[PDB]
């Protein structure tokens, strides 16, 4: 349960169960890695864990966003994955805030904006 691959992270965040986020805290402190690294995001697009969380919300709410945000702010790279951006030619600038807004989910927008968020990022 300690070592989780990016597919494992995607599967955990897709279902929406927050209790399966355990073990990542020791995981990134072990190999000295961060959630912002390319080792846990899609190489082609750049979709991250938060993005995969936002692409599916059970009735406009997820309980797995808060643990991920708090673990990232505890042991993250100076950008808490909220201002980290994709490098795709088709989605150059497709921010997480944009995905939160596009799904008409105000609550996750509030969470992201109170957990630090650069609105003026290019898209």
How would you write 29-95 as a 3-class SS string?
HHCCCCCCCHHHCCCCCCCCHHHHHHCCCCCCCCCCHHHHHHHHHHHCCCCCCCCCCCCCCCCCCCC
Experimental method of this PDB entry: cryo-EM
How far is residue 37 from each of residues 15, 42, 109, measured CA to CA in Å?
23, 10, 23
Q: Which pair of structure tokens corresponds to residue 51? A: 């993005």
* Burial class of residue 66 in the structure, from the number of CB atoms within 10 Å of its CB (0-12 exposed, 13-18 middle, 19+ buried): middle
As a whole number of angstroms, the distance between CA 83 and CA 100 comes to: 13
The DSSP letter of residue 19 is: G
Report helix, strand or coil for 101. helix
As a whole number of angstroms, the distance between CA 13 and CA 50 comes to: 8
Decide: 28 and 36 in contact? Cβ < 8 Å.
Answer: no
Decide: 46 and 87 in contact? Cβ < 8 Å.
Answer: yes
Site of tokens 């989910």: 105
As a whole number of angstroms, the distance between CA 3 and CA 42 comes to: 18
């Amino acid at each position: 349960p300690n070592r989780f691959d990016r597919d494992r992270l995607f599967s955990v965040v897709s279902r929406g169960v927050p209790e399966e986020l355990t073990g990542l805290l020791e995981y990134l402190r072990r190999t000295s890695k961060y959630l912002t690294d390319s080792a846990y995001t899609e190489g082609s697009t750049g979709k991250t864990c938060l993005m995969k969380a936002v692409l599916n919300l059970q009735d406009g709410v997820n309980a797995c966003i808060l643990p991920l945000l708090q673990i990232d702010r505890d042991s993250g790279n100076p950008q808490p994955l909220v201002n980290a951006q994709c490098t795709d030619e088709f989605y150059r600038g497709h921010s997480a805030l944009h995905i939160a807004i596009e799904k008409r989910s105000l609550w996750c927008v509030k969470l992201l904006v109170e957990n630090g968020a650069n609105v003026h990022i290019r898209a």
